[PDB]
């Protein structure tokens, strides 16, 4: 009877994973999941080896499919997106940016202190560059600050180029580079452990974080005015709902048959 319950457990896990994907059809930066199953074959020294009925179906791993999601256009300079491979670096505490998590949604804004933060008031991290210098001076990530006054002159517009550099223009007609958004990549994206709010953290199965600039090396570009929706396909998810129910029903029939066998002997 446990083999049938293994099928029911495997099928219900498939339903729960698909239902999770459908629920997050509108969350920004969501990466869908796929339930992977494996076989069970246990034998001992005293077990016959010629006939080997399986032990059922085992859950192998709930994958974290990381393909690029479709982009929405909001015409908002504070909404960002990574076109390619990479995640944004976001720290919950401004003082300590080492305790940071990886995210894919770029819905940012300015706090009351003019720090570019997420919806959860978590500070975005970036590289510190001199106003006159070019490339990154010190590679250590720091929270991104866009001053209201620089000189003086009051902030007028903020825009991001393909290199991720945040540029703020002021009343005095002075364009000052205030930094560039840091991009993080890992050798294994599916090894990242999932936190809340469409955010990940580094693990040992995912390797170490790779800090780099946008449009440099293996990293992608940064586009402002765009957001990335969920990377799920509604038709595929709805169909997977169909196939998973007809596998819970088939397995439940096997569970029903096994019970009726035991009832048959109990009436002798």
């Amino acid at each position: 009877s446990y083999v049938s319950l293994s099928g029911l457990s495997a099928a219900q896990l498939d339903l729960n994973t698909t239902s999770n994907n459908i629920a997050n059809a509108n969350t920004y930066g969501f990466k869908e999941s796929r339930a992977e199953f494996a076989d069970v074959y246990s034998n001992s020294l005293f077990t016959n080896a010629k006939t080997t009925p399986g032990g059922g179906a085992q859950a192998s791993q709930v994958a974290q499919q990381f393909h690029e999601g479709s982009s929405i256009y909001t015409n908002n300079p504070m909404d960002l997106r990574v076109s390619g491979t990479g995640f944004f670096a976001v720290a919950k505490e401004r003082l300590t940016p080492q305790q940071n998590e990886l995210t894919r949604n770029g819905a940012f804004h300015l706090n009351k202190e003019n720090y570019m933060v997420t919806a959860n008031d978590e500070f975005l991290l970036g590289y510190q560059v001199d106003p006159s210098s070019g490339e990154v001076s010190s590679y250590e990530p720091q929270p991104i600050n866009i001053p209201a006054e620089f000189g003086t002159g009051f902030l007028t517009k903020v825009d991001f180029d393909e290199n991720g550099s945040v540029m703020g223009t002021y009343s005095n007609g002075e364009n000052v580079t205030l930094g560039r958004v840091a991009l993080v990549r890992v050798p294994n994206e599916q090894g990242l452990d999932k936190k809340g709010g469409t955010q990940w953290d580094s693990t040992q199965f995912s390797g170490d974080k790779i800090w780099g600039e946008s449009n440099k090396g293996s990293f992608g570009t940064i586009n402002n005015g765009m957001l990335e929706q969920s990377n799920i396909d509604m038709t595929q998810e709805l169909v997977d709902l169909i196939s998973a129910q007809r596998n819970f029903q088939a397995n439940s029939r096997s569970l029903e048959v096994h019970n009726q066998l035991q009832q048959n002997i109990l009436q002798i």
Binding site: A38, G54, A57, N188, Q190, D208, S243, I268
Partner: protein, 262 residues
């Protein structure tokens, strides 16, 4: 106590093994690269009461002798190693073997295990491993950190593209192993097989030469279980199970009657 009690006991055991095999097939109806199994039935030895062919008078032999069977058993659980359908996926690291062949991985004890499941991934070092227990793939395929995309050729050559460099760099070469009798493999779980005596020697080569199958990138091989056949066989095995219990029920009632009478 009664000969029919033991014969029907073997009948119940045989159908339980058959139903257990069918129930396992239904459980793995979504397992990638799973091969369905069917039970093989055979009759046990026959007790020799009257010898067929015995010389019952000169020039006259017993046309049919009194030979009572001992029941039946499931002698083998034969794996049906036919190809499954292809699932089109967007992942760049899940592969399919189009035709005969098996992916080879390194088991923790040091031996090489052979699998049909193509759901692969990477570890922290970039080595191509499985998406389950993370077994390394033989031969090791290390994806460099400078790669922007991964392409797996039909011939198994794994190449990646590096920024600012045309003519994508080859980072590995996959090899797949075929068996003369893949049904003789020992399933050790986790979608893995081990070679046995009846399986034959593992013959290795490039995936696409010497009769080996091709490697299909971004494609998965579905299980070959036919739920329609599994459910119908489930009903038939249940009927044979219940009619064997009727013999036991009849034998039990006979013994109860005799004890009260004799």
């Amino acid at each position: 106590m009664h000969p029919a009690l033991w014969v029907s006991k073997t009948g119940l055991d045989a159908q339980q093994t058959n139903i257990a095999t069918i129930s396992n097939n239904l459980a793995n109806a979504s397992t990638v690269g799973y091969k369905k199994s069917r039970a093989v039935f055979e009759d046990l030895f026959y007790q020799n009461i009257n010898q067929p062919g015995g010389q019952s008078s000169q020039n006259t032999e017993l046309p049919s002798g009194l030979m009572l069977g001992a029941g039946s058993k499931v002698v083998a659980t034969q794996k049906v190693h036919t190809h499954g359908n292809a699932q089109t996926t967007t992942n760049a690291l899940d592969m399919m073997v189009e035709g005969d062949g098996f992916f080879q991985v390194t088991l923790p004890d040091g031996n090489i295990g052979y699998t049909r499941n193509g759901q692969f991934t990477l570890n922290g070092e970039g080595t191509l491993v499985t998406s389950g227990s993370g077994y390394p793939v033989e031969p090791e395929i290390v994806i460099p950190e400078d790669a922007i995309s991964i392409t797996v050729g039909t011939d198994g050559e794994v190449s990646v593209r590096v920024r600012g460099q045309q003519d994508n760099q080859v980072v590995g070469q996959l090899t797949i192993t075929d068996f003369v009798n893949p049904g003789g493999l020992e399933p050790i779980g986790q979608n893995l097989y081990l070679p046995t005596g009846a399986s034959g020697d593992p013959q290795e080569g490039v995936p696409g030469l010497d009769g080996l199958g091709e490697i299909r990138q971004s494609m998965l091989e579905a299980s070959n279980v036919n739920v329609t056949e599994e459910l119908v066989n489930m009903i038939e095995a249940q009927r044979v199970y219940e009619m064997n219990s009727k013999v036991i029920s009849s034998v039990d009632k006979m013994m109860s009657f005799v004890n009260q009478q004799l």
